Design a protein around this ligand. Structure first.
Ligand SMILES: CC(=O)SCCNC(=O)CCNC(=O)[C@H](O)C(C)(C)COP(=O)(O)OP(=O)(O)OC[C@H]1O[C@@H](n2cnc3c(N)ncnc32)[C@H](O)[C@@H]1OP(=O)(O)O
Ligand SMILES: CC(=O)SCCNC(=O)CCNC(=O)[C@H](O)C(C)(C)COP(=O)(O)OP(=O)(O)OC[C@H]1O[C@@H](n2cnc3c(N)ncnc32)[C@H](O)[C@@H]1OP(=O)(O)O
Ligand SMILES: CC(=O)SCCNC(=O)CCNC(=O)[C@H](O)C(C)(C)COP(=O)(O)OP(=O)(O)OC[C@H]1O[C@@H](n2cnc3c(N)ncnc32)[C@H](O)[C@@H]1OP(=O)(O)O
Ligand SMILES: Cc1c[nH]c(=O)[nH]c1=O
Ligand SMILES: Cc1c[nH]c(=O)[nH]c1=O
Ligand SMILES: Cc1c[nH]c(=O)[nH]c1=O
Lengths: 259, 259, 259
């Protein structure tokens, strides 16, 4: 292995082989770090998380194959997160409790995944994505930057289940999926779209449109929505909300000009 | 610390500083009791629960600030519950497995919180409240006494997400929210109201009214409902159901006269 | 006890009394095997699972009564599964992470139960049943062979809650319940029926019928559905899908003739 002298590793932690733990990493009580896990500098790993969780091939003969997991700098992973090998997570990642993340998945930078979320295999999550509590992200889903998935959202992938050909959902830049919504397989939710709470999204959602209901139907442009408190137009949200965003200290327009 | 000689503390338990464990408390295998936790007499804490879980300020410098957690007498907390500091829980509390309860939250007496439920910060839960499996209780929610939240209910708080001003849901005395229902931000669900399974509640619900659907619509008075088995009028439920309630040994009317 | 010399039992495992662990069983780090647990040959038990979890009577006096749990051969149970006593699980069972299974429950052979699922007490699950992530299975539910419950499905049982007389849902052979659907108490979902994603099923569903919506309504025969990719008729699914099924190596028709 390769573990930093500044790493703090609490009681009960179990470490395997070919593990690299960088500087100022703190691994809380009881974590099990399985083989082929690389934890980048400054990260915190919550108690009893299990990192480099076994892929299916392990069970053939109980011999652990090599499926490297890398976690980026400064993660803040909370308790009992389970993360599979063959997955890459970027920097400043943060989680709630008991989150599960499968293999062959890629998660960008400054992403947040709340308590109980279940991210499946072969999932793509871009940067500054915010997934709240108990969100199910099915295999093949593609979540672009700045997307928000609120509690209990479920992204499906088998159009006529059970079947052999899956179609993942693709969620474009800044789209917001409100709580307890379910999206059907292969659906494209376009930029700056808003899917209202509890919707059953059976059709693509056009850019800057609001849909609600079961099945969800277009109700209006996102720009029509007013703040319930202040009466100000809310969307695109990038102009009215910036806590934790990269243009927090400036403004979106100046920010975007720079990138 | 201050731990009772009658307390039973199983193998693997980890105890921090400024912890008080009263008489006849039983802490099962592997719990991690973090600093500033007070567990009242006669309580049972399920294996691997983590009590006094770290608030956000801890991560600034990995130095644990003081945020006291108090749990009342006779709790029956099941496995792997995670409970934050700056929270108060009353007596005879009981939980299912893997429940998460955040900080700055207040939970009354004789409350039950089922498996997987995720109770956020700044939540108020009164007495004799029954929250079932995997219920999401958002920040700012106010749940009055005798309310029932059935499996997979979700109480939201950001009316035009993501935004800066949250509005919590308030659920009044005895109201019942059936399974897989979602309530929108700032909604008032009045006394003895019934929200039918799977509803999307977008408007306040008047006292003793039944609403169902997406969006939920008023269908009738609660008093119209008949028991599917016995044909007897069911509601107000306080008159037809009393298992585990304070008037269990008497009757509601005599009971209420006394308080 | 009775533990096989070929059993592999990792660090931190806690074993009680009257436990039988057969040949080639592998119990991962930190499992707690409570009294009266029988694990059949060749099974794998994921880290930190808790087997023979305490029934309610234990809490009367903290004295553990006898409530035997049996798990069949070749199980592949993943991490942190919690399984109660007075329950029987058949062979080739497999689970995802953090699944909870209560007492007085019977689970057949070649069944799969995904991450977070919460199976209550007095539940019957037949063979080759596939329950996905975070499915709630209420007390009294009866799930026949080959049924599929997709993510976030919830089967209820109190028709006018809270009440004293529960009615479980019965799901017949091969029926498929798509994601985020909720079924009301006492509902009969017949053979080869399809409940579309996110439905609120308030009425029995006839054999080979598709229902969708809130409340769910019949839309067509299952045989009308075409594969979204190939345009081939999909259902009965037993003729178009067989990965992991008993007729995988042959065909359903020849297979059924033999049984
Ligand atoms: C979990 C957390 O921590 S916070 C979760 C984040 N927030 C959420 O999930 C909820 C966010 N809010 C929503 O999703 C809302 O549904 C919105 C913003 C889309 C609703 O848009 P609104 O500003 O309420 O438009 P408005 O309420 O004036 O339009 C209401 C009409 O459409 C209906 N409607 C509004 N929202 C919905 C909905 N989600 N589903 C079905 N119908 C709806 C209303 O009942 C009303 O019908 P009416 O014509 O009979 O009066
Ligand atoms: C998880 C556990 O352990 S138990 C969970 C606790 N129980 C539950 O969550 C379910 C409780 N039951 C409900 O919520 C029910 O929906 C009730 C009690 C509100 C339904 O009231 P009912 O007594 O069924 O009235 P009833 O069924 O006669 O009225 C039915 C009409 O309204 C419709 N309807 C009834 N309930 C709903 C619903 N939840 N959503 C949408 N429509 C509904 C029916 O389909 C029917 O429509 P129709 O006019 O075409 O026939
Ligand atoms: C989580 C995982 O890993 S995968 C989860 C497994 N897969 C799922 O849960 C989703 C499976 N798919 C479904 O359940 C679908 O709803 C199906 C297959 C029942 C839909 O049948 P379809 O083949 O899409 O029929 P189709 O789409 O042509 O009929 C669509 C019409 O009914 C409506 N409709 C279709 N499905 C639904 C639904 N679930 N709820 C409400 N309305 C629906 C459509 O909006 C459309 O309405 P329209 O007349 O205005 O055009
Ligand atoms: C800030 C915060 C986010 N998510 C959590 O799970 N806990 C916290 O304290
Ligand atoms: C009675 C009971 C309630 N809740 C649980 O999680 N387990 C139990 O045994
Ligand atoms: C194949 C598979 C199924 N379910 C899981 O939880 N993990 C896996 O690797």
């Amino acid at each position: 292995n390769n573990i930093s002298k500044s790493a703090i590793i609490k009681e009960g932690v179990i470490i395997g082989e070919n593990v690299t733990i960088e500087d100022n990493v703190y691994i809380d009580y009881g974590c099990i770090i399985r083989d082929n896990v690389h934890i980048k500098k400054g990260s915190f790993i919550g108690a009893r998380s299990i990192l480099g969780e076994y892929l299916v091939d392990f069970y053939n003969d109980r011999i652990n194959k090599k499926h490297p997991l890398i976690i980026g700098e400064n993660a803040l992973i909370r308790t009992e997160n389970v993360i599979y090998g063959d997955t890459i997570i970027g920097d400043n990642f943060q989680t709630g409790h008991k989150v599960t993340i499968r293999e062959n998945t890629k998660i960008g930078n400054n992403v947040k995944i709340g308590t109980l979320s279940d991210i499946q295999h072969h999932v793509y999550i871009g940067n500054y994505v915010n997934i709240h509590s108990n969100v199910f992200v099915g295999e093949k889903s593609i979540i672009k930057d700045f997307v928000w998935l609120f509690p209990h959202v479920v992204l499906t992938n088998d159009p006529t289940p059970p079947s052999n050909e899956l179609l993942g959902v693709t969620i474009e830049l800044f789209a917001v999926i409100a709580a307890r919504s379910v999206v059907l397989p292969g659906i494209h939710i376009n930029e700056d779209a808003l899917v209202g709470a509890g919707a059953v999204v059976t059709k693509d959602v056009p850019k800057e449109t609001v849909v609600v209901g079961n099945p969800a139907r277009e109700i209006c442009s996102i720009r029509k929505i007013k703040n319930k408190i202040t009466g100000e137009q809310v969307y695109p949200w990038r102009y009215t909300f910036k806590r934790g965003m990269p243009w927090e200290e400036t403004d979106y327009d100046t920010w975007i000009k720079n990138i």
